[PDB]
Amino acid sequence: GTFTSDYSKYLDSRRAQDFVQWLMNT
């Protein structure tokens, strides 16, 4: 199964979204 690997990509997505918020100062 791909659960752990897909979860890691999900975590990276959350981090990228956090970075997007930071870049906007939001």
UniProtKB/Swiss-Prot annotation:
Identify the taxonomic lineage of the organism of origin: Eukaryota, Metazoa, Chordata, Craniata, Vertebrata
Tissue specificity remark? Secreted in the A cells of the islets of Langerhans.
Protein name in the entry: Glucagon
Induction field: Release is stimulated by hypoglycemia and inhibited by hyperglycemia, insulin, and somatostatin.
Organism annotation:
Homo sapiens
Q: Give the function comment from the record.
A: Plays a key role in glucose metabolism and homeostasis. Regulates blood glucose by increasing gluconeogenesis and decreasing glycolysis. A counterregulatory hormone of insulin, raises plasma glucose levels in response to insulin-induced hypoglycemia. Plays an important role in initiating and maintaining hyperglycemic conditions in diabetes.
Q: Which residues of the full protein are shown?
A: 56 to 81 of 180
